[PDB]
Write a protein that binds this ligand. Structure first.
Ligand SMILES: CCCCOc1cc(C[C@@H]2CNC(=O)N2)ccc1OC
Ligand SMILES: CCCCOc1cc(C[C@@H]2CNC(=O)N2)ccc1OC
Ligand SMILES: [Mg+2]
Ligand SMILES: [Mg+2]
Ligand SMILES: [Zn+2]
Ligand SMILES: [Zn+2]
Lengths: 329, 329
């Protein structure tokens, strides 16, 4: 048996409540199982195994199969990105503006949704699967193709031998969870982003708070909408992390994009924007990504949970300043 | 070779442009192939084989497989209902208010959509497939489960040997058709009906007509919306047909509903509304169906194509009066 100083994985896992968790280091030290150990740590930390009577060996067995179904040959959409979205949602769930707001079931749904939200991603976009007449695009009628697929795989895996982590939820619990999880993952579809954000701004206009700053969320509609946006912000959280995490995420999305561009090229198709290795502006793309998508979203979020997300918003403008100012790589 | 007086099938098929076509008689006389002969007649009549260079043996082969994938053990959602929706859309396409309004591609899409809109229906509702945790509900995330499935089957069958009736459309034609067909079939989802109708009323408020009464439809949005509502009206056209057709449709939907109710019963589930053979009011249900769904829809349609649908609307109030007035069966 090892000493505290020796068990470097447990040591890193103590940072699970922090924005800026060294998730790549956790991936390396867990033997490429970041999703499994991070999910397990989060479930213990939130006392979710006890609350829903999830048997630990059932949780581990489900986590392993789910993690097995992220592709390790995909540079960005893989188990490490899933672990990062899970961990980022976990931190956002604990912002003071949201203190005691969500039930345990809603917390389960948000973390479970984050965990499966990209399962079995092939490293190519919805648009590429539509344009190449893939079996998934045919199956799903060109509409939210991957996000529909992530949901169906994440639920189906629950039926494997000893994988049903929801076996002791009541029928009604399982039905509400399912509903919430579907609503959250479908909302990760980037073609939904402009309306999601437009409607988030609208609900922030008429938000109600207790005198001590806690949000009041009285109904399903308002509750689910915060959770959809929360997970979406978690998904789009790379540029708000410490620069050295951020840069690694940027190298991985570019590598994945370039590989799609190469498939397009050998298939004789037009190369999609930002997917051409011979014609790339990595830094300018990040500045555009931040100016057009990431900052508008995080500014509205910070409004919703004011002043909780101020440091996140400062880091984001800093990283934007850095990508804007650097000498190209 | 037969005489005109002997070829009773060709004789019935001359009624293809009429509301009140004897579709059950066509089913019997075609050897249970109403969808095939009615689609073929409509394609010839509209000169669609020539316009899109569909080879006749390709059309027939696709029609036969598509018709084979409607279930003959299902009382209502079967090949005869598909043939009736196809034929009813065909007549609505020819209302004077819509004279020369739609391109040939849009006409193809509406008739093709009608033809596949219920393919492989199992005779049980979306809600039953969700409640029994079926593989389709899992696949499609509880959302438009059957309508997603109808689309995916109708497109997939095109890939069978000699079934590609769209082989000579340009890539861009095939892409617009696909888009239109998906938009039309997804709109047949009854959970979409209240919003479809609310939005149809809104567009009727600001509709524009030429001085001779032809609708002006300048953009995709307005065009697709009329086609969605057209096919939806065709789907919900049973109570607007001559009484003796109407009554046969009513016996078939009740029989299908009762069979679902029986599956629910033997599975020990609660029996869904109108699915309990031991507790049914066939006539009152039709009056409710007309008052709540069918008449509100057809009144708005008749507004849109005024005065074209007046006879349809008169027949509907007549049939409603009849079901209201009868001695229970
Ligand atoms: C390609 C450069 C511009 C965009 O950058 C990024 C884009 C994303 C969104 C991904 C890409 N596809 C998605 O559906 N979600 C995430 C991280 C990124 O960089 C760190
Ligand atoms: C069950 C009696 C009340 C409803 O009657 C009818 C309902 C329909 C709509 C069908 C039923 N399900 C659907 O998705 N579309 C069609 C014909 C009917 O009667 C002639
Ligand atoms: Mg995704
Ligand atoms: Mg249907
Ligand atoms: Zn993601
Ligand atoms: Zn139908």
């Amino acid at each position: 048996h090892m000493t505290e100083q020796e068990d470097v994985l447990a040591k890193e896992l103590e940072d699970v409540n922090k924005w800026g968790l060294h998730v790549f280091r956790i991936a390396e030290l867990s033997g490429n199982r970041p999703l499994t150990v991070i999910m397990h740590t989060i479930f213990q930390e939130r006392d979710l195994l006890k609350t829903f009577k999830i048997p630990v060996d059932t949780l581990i067995t489900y986590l392993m199969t789910l993690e097995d179904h992220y592709h390790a040959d995909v540079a960005y959409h893989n188990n490490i990105h899933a672990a990062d979205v899970v961990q980022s949602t976990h931190v956002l769930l604990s912002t003071p503006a949201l203190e005691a707001v969500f039930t345990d079931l809603e917390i389960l749904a948000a973390i479970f949704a984050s965990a499966i939200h990209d399962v079995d991603h092939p490293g190519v976009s919805n648009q590429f699967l539509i344009n190449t007449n893939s079996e998934l695009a045919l199956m799903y009628n060109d509409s939210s193709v991957l996000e529909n697929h992530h949901l169906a795989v994440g639920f189906k895996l629950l039926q494997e031998e000893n994988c049903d982590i929801f076996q002791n939820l009541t029928k009604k619990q399982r039905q509400s969870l399912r509903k919430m999880v579907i609503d959250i993952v479908l909302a990760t579809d980037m073609s939904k982003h402009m309306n999601l954000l437009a409607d988030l701004k609208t609900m922030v206009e008429t938000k109600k708070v207790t005198s001590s700053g806690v949000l009041l969320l009285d109904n399903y509609s308002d509750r689910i909408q915060v959770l959809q946006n929360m997970v979406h912000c978690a998904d789009l959280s790379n540029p708000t992390k410490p620069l050295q995490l951020y840069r690694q995420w940027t190298d991985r999305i570019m590598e994945e994009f370039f590989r799609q561009g190469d498939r397009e090229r050998e298939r004789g198709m037009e190369i999609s924007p930002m997917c051409d290795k011979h014609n790339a502006s990595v830094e300018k793309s990040q500045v555009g990504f931040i100016d057009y998508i990431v900052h508008p979203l995080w500014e509205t979020w910070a409004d919703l949970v004011h002043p909780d997300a101020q440091d996140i918003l400062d880091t984001l403008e800093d990283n934007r300043e850095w990508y804007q100012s650097t000498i190209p790589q």
